[PDB]
RNA sequence: CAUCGGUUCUGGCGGGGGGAUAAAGGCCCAGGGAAUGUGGCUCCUCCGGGAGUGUUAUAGCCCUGGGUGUAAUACCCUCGCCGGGACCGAGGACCGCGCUCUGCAAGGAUGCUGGCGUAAUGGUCACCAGCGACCCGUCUUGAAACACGGACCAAGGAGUCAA
RNA sequence: AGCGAAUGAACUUUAAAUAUGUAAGAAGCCCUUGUUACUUAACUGAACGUGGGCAUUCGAAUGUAUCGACACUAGUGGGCCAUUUUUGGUAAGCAGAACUGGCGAUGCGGGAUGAACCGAACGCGGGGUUAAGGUGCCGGAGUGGACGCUCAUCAGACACCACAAAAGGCGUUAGUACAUCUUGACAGCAGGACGGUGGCCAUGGAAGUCGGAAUCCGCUAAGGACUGUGUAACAACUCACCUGCCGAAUGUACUAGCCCUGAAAAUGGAUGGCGCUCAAGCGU
RNA sequence: GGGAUAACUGGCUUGUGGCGGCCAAGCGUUCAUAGCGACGUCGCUUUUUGGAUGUCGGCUCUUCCUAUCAUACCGAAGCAGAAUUCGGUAAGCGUUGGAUUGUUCACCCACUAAUAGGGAACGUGGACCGUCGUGAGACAGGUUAGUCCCUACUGAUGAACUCGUCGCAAUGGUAAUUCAGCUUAGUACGAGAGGAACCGCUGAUUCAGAUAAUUGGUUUUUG
RNA sequence: AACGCGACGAUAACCCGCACGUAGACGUAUAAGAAUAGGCUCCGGCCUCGUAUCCUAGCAGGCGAUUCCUCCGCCGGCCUCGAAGUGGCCGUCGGUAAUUCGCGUAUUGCAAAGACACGCGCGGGAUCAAAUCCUUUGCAGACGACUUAGAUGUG
């Protein structure tokens, strides 16, 4: 119908330093820098008050208004992840064989690698490069647990995805192997 | 145009109510004034309401509504120009939350003294605060989570074992027997539910209910009552604190 | 090149008529009404910004009727004026029709100047270049399509003569 | 059309469209008077003779490079396609008549190209303007203007349909009819989701949820003798429904446009090519 | 004997029957009833005890399609394991016999990872003249009808760009396939019986390009 | 790629003769990048517009001054440019309206064959540096074709 204008409103707290450029989103916090580029889509900024950035769009389509909402949604995941930062509680199961877990800094790219073996027994070590930015540790509070903490909501998701798909069973009946590495918990780390 | 939810069709003989169970609301509180004499108004701010069967019981004697705040203040008349009787608009005035009426034919005192003896354990609402500490053992994880000693304590089920581990605890059901670690015990730490002072969310709020942990009090607090013969509206206590439009 | 004649293309200009004697519109006059409510008043997380209120106030708007007014302008029709460009000069004493009448744009191009002979202008051959373009005759069929003849050149070669 | 006219396509005051028969003066008309070889009861008809009027609107319009007759003289006597109408038949094809048009003996511009399409007919030249058809380039002429729609994992491209269907589409836009909505609409979150009652039959055992029937009442704000998960049965979760928080349009079925699929084999090729995406596609 | 058609298909072909009834949104002669009318269901085929194939072929080779037999990949299944079934992405790869038969397939059995289907203008190597018969036919009677060129491609050469050496790479083709053994491991799994997979290592089949150290074979070396 | 390209090595310069001088110049001047729901900047400010900038006067462009040290051009040095290779600076020399003059231009009428020099050429002569033919070789060969070796030598 071709929405003259429409608007999207998004809070920052008193404790960041959001700045974009052209359109690369980069927000400073605590913990770090979060720098995202959003060439790719037709956005206008402002700070329509104090502590609210309005992002707009004019002579726009329904798709339009709908790529503001979740533009606005990634902003404020970021605003999230530099505030708060999240947390993936990765849980791992065996049956007869222990699987063994070791992380390890690869100084150089200055990456975690992350190595699982024994996993049904198949000599083969499975080696994960770790998302830059994120950290991994064994958990000691609760037995066969992982913490993987970052500020990067996407970069921490993606990891503990690449975590829960590298330990995937081949051709055995998934109802009695129950065997694997799982996703336990989702949270922020405050 | 496309794009658009699926609408789950209820295959199910329970429909909407609607507009006739709301007419005949206003006629049940309009038919149900004059009879009785003092109508109280009262509140149960962040209660579970499973017991207000058990006072209709208790109070056989006496008429209690509560739906739509708006709608039962509406059925009373919030402006005086339209006002079944004079004062019924002051309790208008007092109706605006979680608020329910109760039409009594007998002494405001002793209605007052029972709804102050009035008390029952239950489990918390989200939103309060949190009074325990409470948490479960490393070792086998039991009905309650451990609240009863162990001897005398039934396991949890296999069956509430997915709920618990989609709530949030790292447990795991080895042998058929659920357990935080390991089933003999030890190797973990434990799971702590909720904290002292911490406000309890939707998900402790249901780790209770599944454990039958009860940490709220189940009590129901008088805003007021208005007299039909002097057709004036005197609050008491939390009519005076709790908030009104 | 100048003045012309015929055909034609393309710009500008002075008027006339018609509409609802355009509708609108400017300025006034009078009556009425309203909000996407001007000023003002009240509330209002105060560079600010909202909400309610109430019909011109420190902005204005809409409807109706009248005057300026036979207003201007758009659109259509119509009387003419000027400018630039292209193609042609057909006939060869006069006659005719006329006109703005000492001759004229009136039954068809003249006037002035210049260039042209060691080359103006042409012709044939060859090639390149743009566009077009099936190999002829015969025979059949509604039509094609087949089929017959064609290696080339020179000479000969077929409705004639009688009753 | 009417039947507030009658009667009842077969009704009609009236009266279509549409093509299609006949006539529109001087060689023509009327009647009068007679004969006859014919005819009739009979100048009743037919022909033959008299009379009259009206020639400068002689009796509609338009056209006018003339028409009539006799005699003589060559070549020809096939069909094909299509429009409309009409008859018969199939599953679909198709077959047969009549009219008209085109090609047959016809050059020219356009449809990239061509027996059947569109325009238009022909001496040799100069100038001007057009039709069909086109103005992104090949290609001469607009990347002309206005409003919108469409993104196709081989879209579509101008005068045409089968596949094809009351077909599937959580693509997109317009529109129609119904229903809720501060008495707070849809969605969401916190909850309640009861009592008789482990309802009746059945049976290792079946408690709303393995099976057949009934499916009622109290409380209600609402709660089904229950929508699924689950137990050996329980339990428990969840659903229907209902209240609290938030606050403004929705949501059910259809119609219409544009787009996907709606079926495809075997040498590498086609809107003509390149290519084109607020088009160089589609509608005006 | 006459008449008529010269002949067939060319957005044709595939996987889901027909007849009747019920239901059926819509449309219709004026309205779902003049009536047309999909998907389903019911009745018949169709239920109470488990050989068809005529002329043909047979072999090889090239290329292409996939509507995929196997290899690779995943989705689903009481899929414990192993062995499997169905589904789809996929044409790179390869795709053998015997019986039986006129001959093919079916079925049957042997190997083998597997013996899948097709296209390539269905890719290359008689009829009258009659005569003798008309309740049916015959004819040793005839008339007789009846075809070496061009060029693409490859290899080897090749004129001019002064001769020679060392190079670049646009473009075109393109190559690897399958099985097995050791370890994992008699482990995971499993009541038993049985019984994996990853990592790592070693071989073998086919195909392709090479070579004669060693072993057979061949002797106008006529030694 | 036998009609695609590069790097390198080695050559063909003299004597005599004789033959001719644009698939489209006329100011054929102009280097940021990057984005287009941003950019530029001198940091003041600026951006629809290359409708801009540079250059642009003199016999097809003379002579002499006046007067200017501004540009242009040629050669050297310094460095610079390699994707299919060049520009800057400095220096020499030559020219040079920014200013202001006096001299000449005509009758080509109102527009439409001389000399010299420089190259590309051919006809002969001799000059290099090579290639091919010839012989031999045999890692090669249908025939061409290909690997070698023939001028003092590990021939």
């Given at each position: 119908?071709?929405?003259?204008?429409?608007?999207?409103?998004?809070?920052?707290?008193?404790?960041?330093?959001?700045?974009?450029?052209?359109?690369?989103?980069?927000?400073?916090?605590?913990?770090?820098?979060?720098?995202?580029?959003?060439?790719?889509?037709?956005?206008?900024?402002?700070?329509?008050?104090?502590?609210?950035?309005?992002?707009?769009?004019?002579?726009?389509?329904?798709?339009?208004?709908?790529?503001?909402?979740?533009?606005?949604?990634?902003?404020?995941?970021?605003?999230?992840?530099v505030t708060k930062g999240f947390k993936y509680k990765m849980r791992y199961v065996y049956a007869h064989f222990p699987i063994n877990v070791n992380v390890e800094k690869n100084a150089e790219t200055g990456c975690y690698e992350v190595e699982i073996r024994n996993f049904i027994g198949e000599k083969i070590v499975r080696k994960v490069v770790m998302a830059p930015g994120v950290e991994v540790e064994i958990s000691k509070a609760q037995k066969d647990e992982l913490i993987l903490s970052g500020n990067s909501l996407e970069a921490v998701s993606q990891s503990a995805a690449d975590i829960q798909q590298i330990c995937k069973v081949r051709n055995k009946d998934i109802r009695k192997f129950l065997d694997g590495?799982?996703?336990?918990?989702?949270?922020?780390?405050? | 145009?496309?794009?658009?939810?699926?609408?789950?069709?209820?295959?199910?003989?329970?429909?909407?109510?609607?507009?006739?169970?709301?007419?005949?609301?206003?006629?049940?509180?309009?038919?149900?004034?004059?009879?009785?004499?003092?109508?109280?108004?009262?509140?149960?701010?962040?209660?579970?309401?499973?017991?207000?069967?058990?006072?209709?019981?208790?109070?056989?004697?006496?008429?209690?509504?509560?739906?739509?705040?708006?709608?039962?203040?509406?059925?009373?008349?919030?402006?005086?120009?339209?006002?079944?009787?004079?004062?019924?608009?002051?309790?208008?005035?007092?109706?605006?939350?979680?608020?329910?009426?109760?039409?009594?034919?007998?002494?405001?005192?002793?209605?007052?003294?029972?709804?102050?003896?009035?008390?029952?354990?239950?489990?918390?609402?989200?939103?309060?605060?949190?009074?325990?500490?409470?948490?479960?053992?490393?070792?086998?994880?039991?009905?309650?989570?451990?609240?009863?000693?162990?001897?005398?304590?039934?396991?949890?089920?296999?069956?509430?074992?997915?709920?618990?581990?989609?709530?949030?605890?790292?447990?795991?059901?080895?042998?058929?027997?659920?357990?935080?670690?390991?089933?003999?015990?030890?190797?973990?730490?434990?799971?702590?539910?909720?904290?002292?002072?911490?406000?309890?969310?939707?998900?402790?709020?249901?780790?209770?209910?599944?454990?039958?942990?009860?940490?709220?009090?189940?009590?129901?607090?008088?805003?007021?009552?208005?007299?039909?013969?002097?057709?004036?509206?005197?609050?008491?206590?939390?009519?005076?604190?709790?908030?009104?439009?």
């Open positions: 119908m071709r929405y003259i204008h429409s608007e999207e409103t998004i809070p920052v707290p008193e404790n960041l330093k959001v700045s974009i450029k052209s359109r690369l989103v980069t927000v400073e916090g605590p913990r770090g820098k979060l720098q995202k580029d959003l060439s790719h889509i037709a956005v206008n900024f402002s700070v329509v008050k104090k502590g609210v950035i309005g992002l707009e769009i004019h002579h726009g389509s329904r798709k339009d208004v709908a790529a503001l909402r979740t533009v606005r949604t990634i902003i404020n995941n970021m605003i999230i992840g590495i799982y996703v336990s918990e989702k949270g922020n780390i405050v | 145009p496309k794009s658009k939810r699926a609408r789950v069709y209820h295959l199910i003989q329970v429909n909407k109510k609607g507009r006739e169970a709301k007419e005949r609301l206003f006629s049940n509180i309009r038919e149900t004034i004059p009879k009785y004499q003092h109508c109280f108004v009262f509140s149960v701010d962040n209660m579970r309401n499973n017991y207000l069967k058990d006072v209709r019981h208790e109070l056989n004697d006496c008429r209690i509504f509560f739906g739509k705040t708006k709608l039962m203040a509406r059925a009373l008349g919030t402006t005086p120009e339209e006002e079944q009787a004079d004062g019924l608009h002051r309790l208008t005035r007092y109706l605006t939350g979680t608020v329910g009426l109760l039409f009594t034919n007998r002494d405001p005192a002793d209605i007052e003294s029972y709804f102050s003896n009035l008390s029952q354990v239950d489990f918390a609402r989200a939103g309060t605060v949190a009074p325990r500490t409470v948490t479960v053992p490393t070792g086998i994880v039991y009905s309650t989570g451990g609240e009863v000693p162990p001897e005398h304590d039934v396991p949890v089920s296999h069956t509430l074992e997915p709920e618990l581990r989609r709530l949030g605890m790292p447990v795991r059901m080895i042998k058929g027997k659920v357990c935080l670690g390991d089933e003999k015990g030890e190797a973990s730490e434990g799971y702590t539910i909720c904290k002292e002072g911490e406000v309890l969310d939707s998900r402790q709020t249901r780790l209770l209910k599944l454990f039958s942990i009860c940490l709220s009090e189940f009590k129901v607090s008088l805003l007021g009552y208005w007299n039909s013969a002097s057709g004036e509206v005197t609050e008491l206590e939390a009519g005076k604190t709790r908030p009104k439009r």
